[PDB]
Structures are given as structure tokens and as C-alpha cells.
Design a binder for this molecule. Structure first.
Ligand SMILES: Nc1ncnc2c1ncn2[C@@H]1O[C@H](COP(=O)(O)OP(=O)(O)OP(=O)(O)O)[C@@H](O)[C@H]1O
Ligand SMILES: Nc1ncnc2c1ncn2[C@@H]1O[C@H](COP(=O)(O)OP(=O)(O)O)[C@@H](O)[C@H]1O
Ligand SMILES: [Mg+2]
Ligand SMILES: [Mg+2]
Lengths: 503, 471, 49, 163
């Protein structure tokens, strides 16, 4: 508007006017990201540094003769004899409500090309977790949208749910569907029901980060979701500090009165970046070519996402770390450390994904430590009877090949178990609400879906959901507002499902 | 001129420490020239700096003949390579020199091999499918246009034959130019690839060529093998950014880039990682894979081939490259011994273009139905080896016969593998492969035998093979 | 999109020409730039002591 | 007595250990001129430098270099004991590092150091560093200062980040 280039040139003319206080030390050796800086006696531990060419560094190995600093850029800009400068502060990042809607990096700089970010505060990356007196019980429910996740292993606000799995088996698919299903609560006015997402892409390529941000913007889901871009083409210090920088920005909402949800994708890529910088700093290794603080690096960043009490603000933070396993072995080195520190893990096998289960979620391997305490009262009534029928049908699933020798009790468990597993299979980017999932689970657990065929399970899910929104709209709206089921709601739901099953 | 002259102080293997003056030392990834006894030179890339006016350099050739105190002049920049239209049809090396005995490469500009990758704002997402001609590639994992393709497989499964058959039916009819950059190949594979492209019209010595040849097999040292991927990608990146053309980079193999850096990582002062690898495995692989993407200036369809170590996908060089590829064509050693040419896994291969919004609703149902029938046959085959065929009912008997004919129908005879098979090469289109797979799953070809679909094309070749075998 | 690309191309071309003129003026032995550098160092050291 | 100068810890501990016993009865001024004569008669001489890099020596060629560079040179105090400790421990190849660390201790506890702009500063031996820097910067900027990089590089990087 009227020469916009003249406004930016006048404000950037006078800025450099107080930079005559020397700097720090020099540089003796550099290579493979390391930088042996000679001097800097006043530099503290884990402090930000700056080279003469413009590359930043983090002094983490403070010795007596030199100081090992890990460069965040390329090693071609630093040479033997370059002057180094100390920032005087620790490794911090920007936080606040102004970061929603832009993709930031590992240091807080915006890379989406939308101008600056209005940061309301500056939090450090290596922050302490919450104590045992400032934490409460997990009572709020986290709506993921999946029918097999909201009934079996239901996650809550403040817990840590791991997303284990093999290669291409439903790892990032469960985290993307849960963040996009919060549009019904974030678009309203209730601040306690909304949950700001925090996708931290670490270890992925450049094409994978651009495809995930374009899909969330088309469905109105990128306006309240932080994106921490951390590709594998940068240094090892930027990828290893991606878990600490994303947890500090999402902690500002839980300390004020809102809810957050971090998705560390992936947990396997963060462990490889921390071991690369420690091996080049002249340190002893351990198991699987890792340092001594391998179990303490992942437990410190996952313990900070907890649910606060009413005296601290009433906020919570969810941590969704995806553990990329090798070939289905859940008892490895990095797989066993993340499952023991989290309060639940969602397994994903590659054999169930090719059969028809979308997504592949094993009910016999995935469990939640919170139980039914962090779920809705309306969905807890149908999830109690379906848990016993799904466990008995899995152990007797070997008798499905011999259908000519089935008894009375064997034929009832096979027909009801097959219809309950096919009804929970949903498509990609198609999450359901709590009112639509309570009506579909009650028709399969009571016995209203045993008369239908196995191939007609896909057509019955869309026919019963569309007819319930035009004929019995009062039953679906009462189950979502109150969140429970009284005596009048049970009699009205059984009469509507029996009249629609005759056609 | 102010040339930075250095003195050789240490030489053990490929690593050579050069000692220069104070202040005039070269930076990292800088080419260092060295006068030998022949008419060529000894290129050396600076890796790190040990200090005290000395930097450790990695030689890109033979280190035999270097004494303590020789002259080592610095070029000032990195390893320059010839780019443009002059590199098409000639066999370039890792240092940018011709190895085809056809004179020098008359190039107007010379770009460096070491360059930064694209940013997050310059990335351009796409969802276009690329037809290859195979029946198992056009129905299972479809290749994306402008993305990274990885042909995973073991030794002797069919990794080199898969890249040669796809280049004779996609790269020969494309609008852009190709870029065959072989790293860690063999001596006989380099001579056979150049002679086949001249008889088909891809490399014309007296006309026009559209395929860049970059030499660099396993006959050199560890410095030339690790720098072969950066030299070949520099010529393909200039045609898509400055000229704006859909380049096609063919790397064979992609697993040789990670193994070449670990051979000199022990002598450079770095600790070993897992399975005898280097600590910077994820940093070195991500810097070269991110630069071969699709930006706003042009696309780049990378068709690299990954080599699994003794048929193991859980290694550090195979699992780290699966996250930087759209379509992954994993091969198995068990399907190659049964007669499937090639051994294409219908369940292990995955792609991002296998959805209902990119291939359509009709193509999405055929891919899901073929994967469900092949996965269910593995569980039923274990019960027949202990109980027999008496436990199968009417539905289990028909599923076992339909799974055997569907696996042999996807194996078509390639044009480059005519000397080992004997039959002629067949190329099926994308519309013919989807129509033939949907008719066999419904019950229209249940009376035909399993030998009529083995080593055939589409639905037309399966009906002609059944009538000729019965006479 | 065409108006933003035309405005960004004009600002990038004007910034490149201004950077080349500032570098060519300092290499022509500027007498005013050499005398101003010595006076700025003496005034900054007296304010901190 | 250990002075606060750090100076590494392993390689720089050779001159720091001998400085404690040499700082008694005023024996620090004679050690500066005697340490410079040992490095000038082994470097630019091409006579006694035949055992600088060789691993021979062994008593014969190890004790003869410490007696010829102390009796006929300029040494009479405890200057001859410094070369005997480096001959038995195989440390005669780095004679320039032991002589350079001895001159840094006298310039730190009895004078200033660091730098400022262009060339060196003044390095006065008054007391405080704030009262000596303001009185020496005004007298050195006027006299001399030919001023023949840092300010031009910072202005170009700020304009590229805002475009
Ligand atoms: N429930 C589902 N139904 C249909 N398709 C699915 C489902 N879940 C995942 N997919 C498909 O799997 C592909 C990859 O999904 P996702 O991004 O979750 O895994 P990934 O990150 O690619 O795994 P990896 O990192 O091992 O490559 C997607 O293109 C998607 O189409
Ligand atoms: N379509 C095909 N039909 C028959 N044999 C094939 C086909 N494709 C590949 N092969 C066989 O696979 C072998 C691959 O050998 P080679 O290239 O040395 O190992 P790799 O493929 O692991 O690099 C060849 O000897 C060839 O005979
Ligand atoms: Mg993922
Ligand atoms: Mg091969």
C-alpha cells in the first residue's frame, strides 16, 4: 500500500549501534558438525553460540582447554581460525498464541513465508517436567475419531500414547486423524474442549512435510496446529533438539487454561540424531551404538506432557510419539524404552493392514493405562460388553476354517465377532463423532447386526447413520450434549434400530 | 596468482593430511589438485580440519606414489562438473572429466558438486501417476511423477534388470533428458549400458542425445564412490532449474553411497555406529536425497535402486532410505526362485499414489481385492502342509486356485531379459492391466489353467495361450 | 499472485543494484569512510568507562 | 602457588610447574632471557637440530644438548633443569611451546593484553582495565591509524534477510 518497500527500509536502517563488547573465543578444529572452540571461559552449558560466517552453535562439551560446540549448519562455512561469539543465553525457542498457523523450524524461525511470528514469551528447550503435587487424574477424553481407538484403548488428556508399528502400517495415519477430528470443538467457543495440535516432523524428507501441511489446510485444520519442520538434510543438532523445542511451545497453552497435543513423528528418528552428536564429541558409547543417557533423553521429554490440577490452571498436554520398529519386534532397544515410559502403546502390524482392517490396530496388543476413567459415559456403556466379545472371538478364531463342525455357542461368537471388527474399520480422513460411534456400537453388541451379511457391513454403516440424522435427531443430539445414557435413551435407541433392520 | 599451496604430511589409505600456511587454508568440501607423473591429476576433497595449519583430505583416486612433502595446490572452490547440453551422450567421471575418448566436454559453465537442498517454501507437491508398463507396478505400488522411487532387493534378485527395463520404455519416450549416474556398479555393467542406448536412439554420437552417463563403479577407491552421487546429481539439477525440464535420475545402486562413506570413516577420526556404519548416516543420506526432489522450476523423477544386505530390510542403509521415497518396489528372494519374472512383492510394496482420489474408485477396488486374496493365501497354506486339502471347504478351494493364477499373471517378460527367458518382451498399458485383474477376481477366467497366465501380457495374451496349449 | 510477483521482483532487483553500488564506492578509496571509523571507536570506549 | 591463567592443562603444565619454584628470591627476570637463547640455537642454526625429530638421543645425544646450552650459553640458576625433564620424557620436539608459555605469565600478572581494532592495543601495566582503555584509545586513534570488512558484511546480511 503506497510504496510498501519504503516502510521496511526506514525501520531497518538504524539497529546496529551497540556491538563493541568483543565476543568470546576462536576456533581450533571443525568437522562433521563438531567445532573445537578455543576459549570462551564465561560460556555456560547448553548455550547458543555464533560463528564469523553466520552459522550458529550450541556449546555442550565444555572442557578445560577447548569447548565442543555443535554447529547447526554446514561445516564448509567454518574453518581453522574463525572468530566465535557467545550469545549469553541458553537454547530457547519462541512460544505463545501467535505461532498457530505457521510452520516453524527447530529454533523458532518461520519457514512458511508468512512474515514474522508474534511471540508472547521465550521458553527454554531443556525444561523440567511437572511434579507429583501439580498433577491430577486423567478425566478428560481425547476424541480421536476412530471407532477402534475410542472404544478399546481410549486415550485421555495428559497421558502418553505410543504409536508403535512397522513400515507403512498405520503409524502417522492415527496421529493425523486425531488432530483433524478436533474441528467440532475448536471452531466453537468452549476453550476447555479445544485441543491445539503440535505435529513435530523429525527425520522426514522435504516432500513429506509439504504434503502433510497441504492436506490440513484444505479441511480447516492448520489454523490451530503448530508445525515443527525438522528435515534430515540439516545438522544433527537441529534434529535432536526438535523434541525439546516443540514441547516448550506447546506447554504455554497447558499452563494458561487450554489443552495441547504433541505428535513426535517419529521417536526412532530422534534417537539417531542424539547419538550422532555424542559420537563425534569424543564420548563412550553403550548398547546399539548409543550414549549413556539413552533412556533419560526420551523419558525427560515425555514426562512434561501431563495433566495439571485446578490450582495450576486446569490444562493438559498429550504426547503422541510414533515408534518406528524394524520388523514387528516390539522388544528392541529403542522400542522397549519408549513403551515402558509411556502409559499405553498402540501397535500396528503389517499383516492386518493387507486383509481389510483400516487401520491395522491389534486389540490384543494395544492397551491403555487410564482405562475407562478418561472417556465419555455414553460410550463407556457400549464399550464394556464389546471388550468381552472381542477377546473371546480372537482366541477361537482358528475354528473359522471348519464351519461345518460349529456348535451353538461357537456359531454365535464367530458371527458377532466378525461384524464388530468390520464396523470399526473407517476410511482415511473420515473421523466420526461420539454420537455416531455410540449408535453403531450398540447395534452390533446387542444382536441387531447378526442377521445382516458380512459383505453388507460397509453399506449398513452409511445407511444407519444417514437415517438417524433425519428421523431420530433427538437421540443423537442428547448423547453428545449430556454425554451419558439414562433409562429413556436406552428404550428409544432399541426401537429405532429394530424398525430399520427389516429393510 | 595467490594459489594455496600445501604440503603432504600424512598418507594412510584414502585419507591424506595436507599442511598449508596460516590463514591460507582451504575450507571443507574443496577440491585439491596434485601434480603426479602422468598427464592427469590427483583430486582430493577436504573433509575436516585437524588443526595447526593442517586439514585432512580424502583422495578421489589412487594414493600410491605420494611422498611426504609434495605440492598440493587448492582450486578455491568445490569439485566442479560440466553441466548443460554438452554432458549428454558422454561418459563423465566423478571429477567432471570425459572417460569415453571423445575429446573434452565443451561446457560454458561448471557448477559444483556440493550444494544445498531446497527449502520448505520451494517444495511443490503432486499426485500424478507414471505408467511403467509392468502389470505388477501399474496395479500395486504405482510410481509417482517427479518423486523418488526405490527398487529394494537383495543380491541376485533383479535389481539391475529392473532399472534397465524401465529405461527402455519410459525414458526413451519422455520429453526431458535422462541422467544415468551409476555409483558402485560393475565393470561389465557400464559397457553394456552404453552400447544398448546407442542402438535404441538414447545416445547419439553424431546426432542428439538425452541421457547423461556418469562413470564410477567399484573399481576405484572409497573417495570416488562416495562422490559419484553428488557429481551425477549436479548435471540433472541444472536441466530442471535453469532449463526447466523433467529430468530422470537413474542411480544404480543407491546402497553404494552409504557404504562408501563408512569405509573412510574409521580413518577420519570417527567412532563406528551399528553394523559397522558411520555415525553420520542419517545426515549424509538426507542431504543428497532432499536435493533430488520437485520444485517450482521443474520436476525430477529419481528411479534409484537400493541393495539390501543379504536380504535384510532392517539394516541401517535400507530402513533409512524408506522415508525419503514415494514408491518402494521391494523384491523378495523367495519369489524369484519359483519363476516370477520379476520378483515383485504384492504386499511389501507400497506407494503414496495408491488411493481412490488419484487412481479412481475403480482402480482402488482392484488393488484392495488383489492384496486381500494374496494375504489370505499365506494363512491357508500353513494348514495344508500339516492337515492337507481335506480341511478346505468350497470357498477355501476356489481362493487357492485364484491366488496362484493372479501371481503368475503379473510377471511379464521384459525386453532387456530376452537372452535369459527366450520369449519376446511384452508391454501392457495401465487400462489393460486394471481390466484384466478385475475380470479374473469375479469368476470370468476360473476355467482357464494357471499356465496360460504365466509369462503373458494382458487379457488378450491369456486367452491365446490357453487355446494353443490344449492342441 | 501476479501483482505480488511483480512487486517482489522489483524489490529484489533494486536491492541487488544498491548492494553493488555500495561495494564499488568503498573500493574507490573513500576518505570520509576512513576518518569516520577512527572517531567511532574512541567515542564508544569513553562511554563505557 | 597456582596463578589463575589456566593455559590448557596437559600440554601447558610444563612451564607452570617450573614457575612455582622459580618465583623465589627474585628469579623470574633471568628466566626470560635464558629461555629465548635455547630456541634460537636449535631452530635457525642447522647444526644442533639433528636430534629434534629423531628417536635416537638416549643419554648421549640427550644430556649433551642440555649442558652445551647452559654452560657456554647464558644460564647459571635453575635454567638447566628445564631441559633435563624434557629429554627423559621425550618432549624435546616441542621446545617452542614451553618457551611461549613462560612469557604469558609475566604479561598477565604485570600488564594488560587482548586487542581492540586494526593492530595491537597498548597493554599497560597500571591496575584496572577500564581506566587504562579510555586513556589509551584517544591517544592511539589520532597518532597514526592508517585504517587500511566487518561493518560491510553485517549491513549486507541484514538486507537479505528482510527481502
Ligand atoms: N486406515 C487406512 N486406510 C487406507 N489407507 C491407509 C490407512 N492408513 C494408512 N493408509 C495409507 O498408508 C500410507 C502411509 O500412511 P502413513 O503416512 O500413516 O505412514 P508412513 O508415515 O508413510 O509410514 P513410513 O514412515 O513407514 O513410510 C498413506 O498414503 C495412506 O494412503
Ligand atoms: N525378467 C527376468 N527373467 C529371468 N531372469 C531374470 C529377469 N530379471 C533378472 N533376471 C536374472 O536375475 C539376475 C540378476 O543378476 P545381477 O544383476 O548380477 O544381480 P542383482 O539383480 O541383484 O543386481 C540375472 O542373472 C538374470 O538372469
Ligand atoms: Mg510417518
Ligand atoms: Mg545391479
Amino acid at each position: 500500500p503506497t510504496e510498501v518497500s519504503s516502510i521496511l527500509e526506514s525501520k531497518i536502517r538504524g539497529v546496529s549501534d551497540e556491538a563493541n563488547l568483543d565476543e568470546t573465543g576462536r576456533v581450533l578444529s571443525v568437522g562433521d558438525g563438531i567445532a573445537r572452540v578455543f576459549g570462551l571461559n564465561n560460556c555456560q552449558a547448553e548455550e547458543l553460540v555464533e560463528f564469523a560466517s553466520g552459522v550458529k552453535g550450541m556449546a555442550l562439551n565444555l572442557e578445560p582447554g577447548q569447548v565442543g560446540i555443535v554447529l547447526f549448519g554446514s561445516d564448509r562455512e567454518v574453518k581453522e581460525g574463525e572468530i566465535v561469539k557467545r550469545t549469553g543465553k541458553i537454547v530457547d525457542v519462541p512460544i505463545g498464541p501467535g505461532m498457530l498457523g505457521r510452520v516453524v523450524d527447530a529454533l523458532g524461525n518461520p519457514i512458511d513465508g508468512k512474515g514474522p511470528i508474534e511471540a508472547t514469551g521465550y521458553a527454554i528447550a531443556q525444561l523440567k517436567a511437572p511434579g507429583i503435587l501439580p498433577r491430577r487424574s486423567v478425566f478428560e477424553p481425547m476424541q480421536t475419531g476412530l471407532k477402534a481407538v475410542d472404544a478399546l484403548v481410549p486415550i485421555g488428556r495428559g497421558q502418553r500414547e505410543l504409536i508403535i508399528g512397522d513400515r507403512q502400517t498405520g503409524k502417522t495415519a492415527v496421529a493425523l486423524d486425531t488432530i483433524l477430528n478436533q474441528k467440532r470443538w475448536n471452531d466453537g467457543n468452549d476453550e476447555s474442549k479445544k485441543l491445539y495440535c503440535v505435529y513435530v516432523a523429525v527425520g522426514q524428507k522435504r516432500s513429506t512435510v509439504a504434503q502433510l501441511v497441504q492436506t490440513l489446510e484444505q479441511n480447516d485444520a492448520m489454523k490451530y496446529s503448530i508445525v515443527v519442520a525438522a528435515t534430515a538434510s540439516e545438522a544433527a543438532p537441529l534434529q535432536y533438539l526438535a523434541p525439546f523445542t516443540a514441547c516448550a511451545i506447546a506447554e504455554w497453552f497447558r499452563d494458561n487454561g487450554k489443552h495441547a497435543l504433541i505428535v513426535y513423528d517419529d521417536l526412532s528418528k530422534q534417537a539417531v540424531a542424539y547419538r550422532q552428536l555424542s559420537l563425534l564429541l569424543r564420548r563412550p558409547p553403550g548398547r546399539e551404538a548409543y550414549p549413556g543417557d539413552v533412556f533419560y533423553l526420551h523419558s525427560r521429554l515425555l514426562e512434561r506432557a501431563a495433566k495439571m490440577s485446578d490450582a495450576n490452571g486446569g490444562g493438559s498436554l498429550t504426547a503422541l510419539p510414533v515408534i518406528e520398529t524394524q520388523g514387528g519386534d516390539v522388544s528392541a532397544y529403542i522400542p522397549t524404552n519408549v513403551i515402558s515410559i509411556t502409559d499405553g502403546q498402540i501397535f500396528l502390524e503389517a499383516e492386518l493392514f493387507y486383509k481389510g482392517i483400516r487401520p491395522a490396530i491389534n486389540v490384543g496388543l494395544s492397551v491403555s493405562r487410564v482405562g475407562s476413567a478418561a472417556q465419555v459415559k455414553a460410550m463407556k456403556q457400549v464399550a464394556g460388553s464389546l471388550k468381552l466379545f472381542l477377546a473371546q472371538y480372537r482366541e477361537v478364531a482358528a475354528f473359522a476354517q471348519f464351519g461345518s463342525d460349529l456348535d451353538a455357542s461357537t456359531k454365535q461368537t464367530l458371527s458377532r465377532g466378525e461384524r464388530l471388527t468390520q464396523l470399526l474399520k473407517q476410511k482415511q480422513y473420515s473421523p466420526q463423532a461420539s454420537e455416531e460411534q455410540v449408535p453403531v456400537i450398540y447395534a452390533g453388541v446387542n444382536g441387531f447386526l447378526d442377521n445382516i451379511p458380512i459383505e453388507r457391513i460397509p453399506e449398513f454403516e452409511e445407511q444407519f447413520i444417514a437415517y438417524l440424522k433425519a428421523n431420530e435427531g433427538d437421540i443423537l443430539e442428547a448423547i453428545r450434549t449430556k454425554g451419558e445414557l439414562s433409562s429413556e435413551l436406552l428404550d428409544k435407541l432399541k426401537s429405532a434400530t429394530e424398525t430399520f433392520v427389516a429393510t | 596468482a595467490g594459489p594455496a599451496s600445501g604440503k603432504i604430511r600424512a598418507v594412510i589409505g584414502a585419507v591424506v593430511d595436507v599442511q598449508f600456511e596460516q590463514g591460507e587454508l582451504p575450507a571443507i568440501l574443496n577440491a585439491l589438485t596434485i601434480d603426479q607423473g602422468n598427464n592427469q591429476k590427483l583430486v582430493l576433497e577436504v573433509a575436516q580440519h585437524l588443526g595447526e595449519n593442517a586439514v585432512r583430505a580424502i583422495a578421489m583416486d589412487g594414493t600410491e606414489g605420494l611422498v611426504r612433502g609434495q605440492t598440493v595446490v587448492d582450486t578455491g572452490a568445490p569439485i566442479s562438473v560440466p553441466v548443460g547440453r554438452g554432458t549428454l551422450g558422454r561418459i563423465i567421471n566423478v571429477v567432471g572429466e570425459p572417460i569415453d575418448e571423445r575429446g573434452p566436454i565443451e561446457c560454458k559453465q561448471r557448477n559444483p558438486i556440493h550444494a544445498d537442498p531446497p527449502s520448505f517454501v520451494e517444495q511443490s507437491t503432486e499426485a500424478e501417476v507414471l505408467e511403467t508398463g509392468i502389470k505388477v507396478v501399474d496395479l500395486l505400488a504405482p510410481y509417482a511423477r517427479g518423486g523418488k522411487i526405490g527398487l529394494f532387493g537383495g543380491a541376485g534378485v533383479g535389481k539391475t534388470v529392473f532399472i534397465q527395463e524401465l529405461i527402455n520404455n519410459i525414458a526413451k519416450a519422455h520429453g526431458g533428458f535422462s541422467v544415468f549416474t551409476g555409483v558402485g556398479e560393475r565393470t561389465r555393467e557400464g559397457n553394456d549400458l552404453y552400447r544398448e542406448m546407442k542402438e535404441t536412439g538414447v545416445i547419439n554420437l553424431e546426432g542428439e542425445s538425452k541421457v547423461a552417463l556418469v562413470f564410477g563403479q567399484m573399481n576405484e577407491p572409497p573417495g570416488a564412490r562416495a562422490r559419484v552421487a553428488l557429481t551425477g546429481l549436479t548435471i540433472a539439477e541444472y536441466f530442471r532449474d535453469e532449463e526447466g525440464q523433467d529430468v530422470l535420475l537413474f542411480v544404480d545402486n543407491i546402497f553404494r553411497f552409504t557404504q562408501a562413506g563408512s569405509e573412510v570413516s574409521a580413518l577420519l577420526g570417527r567412532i563406528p555406529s551399528a553394523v559397522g556404519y558411520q555415525p553420520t548416516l542419517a545426515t549424509d543420506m538426507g542431504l543428497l536425497q532432499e536435493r533430488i526432489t520437485t520444485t517450482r522450476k521443474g520436476s525430477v523423477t529419481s528411479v534409484q535402486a537400493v541393495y539390501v544386505p543379504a536380504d535384510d530390510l532392517t539394516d541401517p542403509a535400507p530402513a533409512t532410505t524408506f522415508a525419503h521415497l514415494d514408491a518402494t518396489t521391494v523384491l523378495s528372494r523367495g519369489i524369484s526362485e519359483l519363476g516370477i519374472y520379476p520378483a515383485v512383492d504384492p504386499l511389501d510394496s507400497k506407494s503414496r499414489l495408491l488411493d481412490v482420489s488419484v487412481v479412481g474408485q475403480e482402480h482402488y477396488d482392484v488393488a484392495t481385492g488383489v492384496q486381500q486374496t494374496l494375504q489370505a493365501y499365506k494363512s491357508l497354506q500353513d494348514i495344508i502342509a500339516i492337515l492337507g486339502m481335506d480341511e478346505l471347504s468350497e470357498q477355501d478351494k476356489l481362493t487357492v486356485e485364484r491366488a496362484r493364477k493372479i501371481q503368475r499373471f503379473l510377471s511379464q517378460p521384459f525386453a532387456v531379459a530376452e537372452v535369459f527367458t527366450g520369449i519376446e518382451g511384452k508391454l501392457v498399458r495401465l487400462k489393460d492391466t486394471i481390466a484384466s485383474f478385475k475380470a479374473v477376481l469375479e469368476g470370468k477366467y476360473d476355467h482357464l489353467p494357471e499356465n496360460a497366465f504365466y509369462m503373458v501380457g494382458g487379457i488378450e495374451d491369456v486367452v491365446a495361450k490357453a487355446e494353443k496349449i490344449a492342441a | 499472485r501476479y501483482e505480488a510477483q511483480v512487486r517482489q521482483h522489483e524489490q529484489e532487483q533494486l536491492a541487488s543494484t544498491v548492494i553493488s553500488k555500495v561495494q564499488s564506492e568503498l573500493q574507490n578509496a573513500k576518505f570520509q569512510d576512513k576518518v569516520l571509523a577512527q572517531a567511532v571507536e574512541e567515542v564508544e570506549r569513553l562511554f563505557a568507562k | 602457588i597456582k596463578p589463575p591463567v589456566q593455559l590448557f592443562g596437559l600440554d601447558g603444565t610444563y612451564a607452570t610447574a617450573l614457575f612455582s619454584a622459580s618465583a623465589k628470591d627474585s628469579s623470574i627476570e633471568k628466566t626470560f632471557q635464558s629461555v629465548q637463547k635455547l630456541s634460537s640455537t636449535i631452530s635457525k642454526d642447522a647444526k644442533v637440530a639433528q636430534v629434534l625429530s629423531n628417536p635416537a638421543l638416549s643419554l648421549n645425544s640427550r644430556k649433551e644438548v642440555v649442558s652445551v646450552l647452559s654452560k657456554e650459553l647464558k644460564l647459571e640458576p635453575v635454567v638447566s633443569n628445564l631441559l633435563t625433564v624434557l629429554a627423559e620424557n621425550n618432549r624435546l620436539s616441542l621446545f617452542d611451546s614451553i618457551a611461549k608459555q613462560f612469557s604469558v605469565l609475566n604479561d598477565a600478572y604485570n600488564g594488560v593484553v587482548e586487542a581492540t581494532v586494526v593492530s595491537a592495543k597498548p597493554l599497560d601495566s597500571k591496575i584496572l582495565n577500564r581506566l587504562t582503555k579510555s586513556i589509551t584509545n584517544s591517544k592511539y586513534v589520532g597518532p597514526g591509524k592508517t585504517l587500511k570488512a566487518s561493518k560491510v558484511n553485517k549491513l549486507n546480511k541484514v538486507l537479505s534477510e528482510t527481502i
